Amino acid sequence: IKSALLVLEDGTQFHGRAIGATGSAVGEVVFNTSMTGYQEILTDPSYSRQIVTLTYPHIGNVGTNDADEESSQVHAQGLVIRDLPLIASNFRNTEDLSSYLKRHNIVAIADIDTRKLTRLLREKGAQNGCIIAGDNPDAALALEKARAFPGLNGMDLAKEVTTAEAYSWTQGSWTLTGGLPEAKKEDELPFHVVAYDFGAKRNILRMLVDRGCRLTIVPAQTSAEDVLKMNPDGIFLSNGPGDPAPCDYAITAIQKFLETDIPVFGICLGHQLLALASGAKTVKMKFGHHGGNHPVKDVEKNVVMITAQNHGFAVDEATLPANLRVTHKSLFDGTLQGIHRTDKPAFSFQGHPEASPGPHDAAPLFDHFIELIEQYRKT
Amino acid sequence: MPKRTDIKSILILGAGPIVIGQACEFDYSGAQACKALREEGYRVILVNSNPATIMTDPEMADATYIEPIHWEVVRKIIEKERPDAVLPTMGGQTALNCALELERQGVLEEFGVTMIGATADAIDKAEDRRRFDVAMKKIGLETARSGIAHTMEEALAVAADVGFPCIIRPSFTMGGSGGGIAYNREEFEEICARGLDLSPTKELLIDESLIGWKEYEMEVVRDKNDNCIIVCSIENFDAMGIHTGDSITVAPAQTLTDKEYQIMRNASMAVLREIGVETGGSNVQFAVNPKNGRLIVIEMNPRVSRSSALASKATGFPIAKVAAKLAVGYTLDELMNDITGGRTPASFEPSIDYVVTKIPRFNFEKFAGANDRLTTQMKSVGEVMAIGRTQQESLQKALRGLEVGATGFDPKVSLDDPEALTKIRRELKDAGADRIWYIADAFRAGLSVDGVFNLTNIDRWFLVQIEELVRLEEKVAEVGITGLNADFLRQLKRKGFADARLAKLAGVREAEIRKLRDQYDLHPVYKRVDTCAAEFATDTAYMYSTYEEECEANPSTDREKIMVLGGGPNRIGQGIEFDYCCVHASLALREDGYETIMVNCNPETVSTDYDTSDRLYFEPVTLEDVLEIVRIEKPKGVIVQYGGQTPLKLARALEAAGVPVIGTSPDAIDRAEDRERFQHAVERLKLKQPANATVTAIEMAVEKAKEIGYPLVVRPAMEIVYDEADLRRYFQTAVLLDHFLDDAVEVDVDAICDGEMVLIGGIMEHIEQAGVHSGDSACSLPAYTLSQEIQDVMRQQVQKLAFELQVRGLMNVQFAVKNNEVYLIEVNPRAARTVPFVSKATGVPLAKVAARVMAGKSLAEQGVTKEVIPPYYSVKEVVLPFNKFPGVDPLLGPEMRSTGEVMGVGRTFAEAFAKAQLGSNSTMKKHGRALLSVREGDKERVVDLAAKLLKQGFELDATHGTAIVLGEAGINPRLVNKVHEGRPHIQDRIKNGEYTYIINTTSGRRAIEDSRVIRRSALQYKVHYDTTLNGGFATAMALNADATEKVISVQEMHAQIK
Ligand SMILES: Nc1ncnc2c1ncn2[C@@H]1O[C@H](COP(=O)(O)OP(=O)(O)O)[C@@H](O)[C@H]1O
Ligand SMILES: Nc1ncnc2c1ncn2[C@@H]1O[C@H](COP(=O)(O)OP(=O)(O)O)[C@@H](O)[C@H]1O
Ligand SMILES: CC[N+](CC)(CC)CC
Ligand SMILES: NCCC[C@H](N)C(=O)O
Ligand SMILES: [Cl-]
Ligand SMILES: [Cl-]
Ligand SMILES: [Cl-]
Ligand SMILES: [Cl-]
Ligand SMILES: [Cl-]
């Protein structure tokens, strides 16, 4: 018997079993509807300071493997699941889930009523919680740390997960046959994109390369002036944890870029940054969107896409500046999903066109981005 | 776009009688589509020869045709209703096949009927094996190495290309009909011949083996805007090589990584796009090599299916409802999601926070000489489904809900059996229906996970789970009841162990375990199905039990509640008929204002459609599970009389536990079911009953037999012995002893008793005599030979019995008429399977009436007091599964083997019969050569039958004894050699297409066994044959009729009643 306890800000306790590191973990608690893709989710930087609960009972059926990691580490603050399977059974598995968590030093609990949890969060909205795994997990304590949690509202986490120094990315996407391919040679990639690392998913980068982009990853705080110097064929605003709002450096920069004719594309946090930079306002959603079955309509084409979502903040549609035209909306709640600059080659998507995990439905968003580039180069 | 407007009327092609591989799932789907289109304000016309369907209920559509599902007949329906469009994707292969014939026959053109949902081309593209294969390659999806055949020669050549074992798959068939696995040449020829003949397009696809790879399915829905969604993914437990329908399957998929799942998901959508399914759903099948993720496309079903039904139950997403709406121009984004209170659109992919398990139900015991090994051709007669928070819980719940007397992993072999491992080994290596239990026994016997894997190819992911359950059971057995502390017991419950299973291991009564849970306050919670993993609330109460924290039941304190217990998975003898009743009980009572609670776990049925009731508990129909619901619902009354044997068997126990059982009491039920109890009441009532004995010893029987008199009906399976020598004979191979009433008419009577009066629902005269199971006999309503004089006697006898036994609601009585004498065969104090047919025939919804009676409203009070005798004849005919089990002698007897039934409506008996026979898929012709080969006791009457066929233009053939009798009558048949006689013999003649009709009657175990060849050949070669003289006469009669001449709707039928 290796106990684990999870306590929410409201005093709601969930007693289960420890399946990862011994320790405590505090963060915002969220729920994720993805029936597959747990590993990629765990390694999503946007999960920084967030305790992840998965709705699908059995988590770990396929074990883990390096190709399925979206970053260099496990961003989730903690993991809450209903059942940890006896075994991992998949040809791609290199390490069982528990071993994996232990290895990444993650506090995780299993065997709790995840459904009860989920409905709580949906009903009463996001809550901060704490997980304690050890011989005797002190509830009172757990309540203390959860309650003590600052909160993700107004929390800039992009700066925390961003690369120290810039770097170059030339690697493409995985194949069943080929696995993760060798990185390409520079002369091999047509365009050169500058990507702000706000806690970037490897899949976004790989998918950009896939379309013939050579990348230069840059720290979040990099200055427009510095970027411009690079003579970028386009600029990219990655996804990332926390509140976009407090990221003044990024906003300021973006505005600078928006004075030029260079193509700009934002994904998730980058979407929010773009919006803010344009004069819009962001809000923190009740419980947000975390799942991979989220319908999003392309208002222009009147076509729906099932997408991969991971966001706790949104862009308020009703505050949109006239230079911002709505391109996509959620079919689940009507929330804002995409925007394009009426006047500039700048657009973004709230969801994850790169998926990983998730439907490949929104991939074409990238395509547009290339178009703009190809056309910016024609000039 | 919104709904189509260039359409007003829609004809929906129904599935026909229930058969192995094409079952209840089509009533559910068909009903959903009627409902959907009807809600959309279309005029709906439907055809379905299966009267036991909710979709044929008069109030569900506008023009309902219970007519044979033949293109000529449908043509007459189209000619007469002039539908604008036809939807052919809600009725099995029957509907697909018919839609295309109609097209081929140019009928569609002729009347300007537009095919919707799916086009003829799409359908063919998926149904034509060659075409499908071409399309896959065209979209870069891999398919097994294969080849097309249209002849045995070509087939032999493909086999030669792929080698054995090989997989044979007919074009235009499903449920593995006409297919199989050829391990050798011999087998190869058999299967292939069979499938070529059976293929509507006389085409086979022969593939190399992928046996053992993983098997997956995906349910897809695509709209005209090109929106596409995965409604559900399914991972088969049983690997490739065992048909999906005969496999244990779960949702969602479990062992694919997200990367693999996306590829599969992309493939699925690509397949629909290529085939051209633009406005509805489809089931896409695949094979995955566990070793490397290698993906192969197996097939695609351009329609609703047993999997889409399963998927609908599993996720809460009503596929068929949505599809019907798509068929009419609606787009997914336009429709709302039912269960999330319409709060969200149908354009999304469901997410579930639980595990769904489906386990097929077999009936091999009913087919002695059949090959009981599982293969690519379905052999299952039904299925159960379970929902659990975990796989173990889910699986165990399904096992206990299976209705096979399992409480979970009950042992099959003894621990102390020296040959046990060998037996296990065999069952594992060559899966039969019992495999699941042998797996558990394997673990108890010392076999490892890897060892079991190697034999079975079932993914270790599942296997480890069963092993863990075994180890847990071993603990229980060691610690015994003493060791069942609250902590441990809870752990056990969470893994889905039934109280009964635990009881057996602890050597206590199941009630003890249950008391123990009461003590510890260890009760399950109820979660709701919502399609979105609780991301959105729901206003629907579709729930399942689980041992968790939070309860989602929220019972009302408000209403008086009525609970309706389902029968679980369908099996032979316990079909859709019972579910029909259950549904009616619910619609009526609900309509009456009660809060109706349905308890059932059959994924195929309308009973488990959340629309059917106020509250749906998708649970095993067991005392344990029902007690838990009552516990929390505190219903006013519970109906146990409508779900067949399943709930019937729980009646006593439920009452004992304080359950408020309504309608005929459990004691009352027992008086009828108990031979002894029953013998006394008969005696009590001064009623006629065949002489009977109760023999314990062989020699006791032979004496008692002398008393009773031969022939004899030996009920312990049933047998009919004819002489002393026969008695021993049986006894060897082998107790009630009953005189068998030879040359007797069998009759069924359905009635309702409210304690005040008795309402006669219907008097049905069977065609086949007593001795041929009522369930396998065709019948007429009204009788077609029975004197009024005699029927009245039976009516009076039914009233006498209704009152005596205290019937409260439905009943059914079976009599035998011999020499103007009424003999009582049996009484069934509940809803019988004839109920739906009688309701249809008479226009009286007996299940609804009996339900109201059970609930308090008298017959007088409802204004249903007089027996209805319709102006037309209604004939019911059955469909037998013999074609699925060729080793089986296709002969009728005292034991029921049929799967379904149809109904024929005619101005005369001959016309009704004609329609019934045709509806039953009979290959009868109105010309040709007939073969007569009858027993002694029939030689007399055969003359008149031989003449009748003569008048018709038939030529006759006959075996020795028959020819002799006919000769003496002045009828000179063409002699034919019995097989031992010489040549040619019947076999040869039948095999060479000589006959268009066969009448063969036999009496005596020995005589039967000897004549086996005739029947088996008649079936294999598709010749219509009768095994009863009564049957032949009926056939004779029908020839004078034309089943396509006229068609009438149920609405019309019912308006004709005065
Ligand atoms: N190449 C193969 N090797 C082994 N089993 C196969 C192969 N192809 C198909 N099967 C098996 O046969 C079953 C029936 O084939 P399917 O194409 O689905 O026909 P149907 O339309 O009659 O259901 C599959 O569910 C699977 O178990
Ligand atoms: N004594 C008998 N004489 C003739 N036929 C009988 C006799 N007893 C039963 N049968 C035949 O056997 C069938 C099944 O017997 P029944 O008592 O009704 O059992 P079940 O429980 O299967 O309905 C009847 O439908 C009938 O054809
Ligand atoms: C599957 C049902 N049939 C094939 C379409 C055979 C019973 C109808 C004739
Ligand atoms: N109602 C039973 C089916 C009849 C079949 N043709 C037989 O006589 O065997
Ligand atoms: Cl909990
Ligand atoms: Cl806010
Ligand atoms: Cl078929
Ligand atoms: Cl291969
Ligand atoms: Cl391979």
Ligand SMILES: [Cl-]
């Ligand atoms: Cl067989």
Ligand SMILES: [Cl-]
């Ligand atoms: Cl004919």
Ligand SMILES: [Cl-]
């Ligand atoms: Cl005889």
Ligand SMILES: [K+]
């Ligand atoms: K727990």
Ligand SMILES: [K+]
């Ligand atoms: K038309």
Ligand SMILES: [K+]
């Ligand atoms: K097909």
Ligand SMILES: [K+]
């Ligand atoms: K191939």
Ligand SMILES: [K+]
């Ligand atoms: K299978």
Ligand SMILES: [K+]
């Ligand atoms: K299937």
Ligand SMILES: [K+]
């Ligand atoms: K009969």
Ligand SMILES: [K+]
């Ligand atoms: K009976």
Ligand SMILES: [Mn+2]
């Ligand atoms: Mn098929």
Ligand SMILES: [Mn+2]
């Ligand atoms: Mn199939």
Ligand SMILES: [Mn+2]
């Ligand atoms: Mn009976």
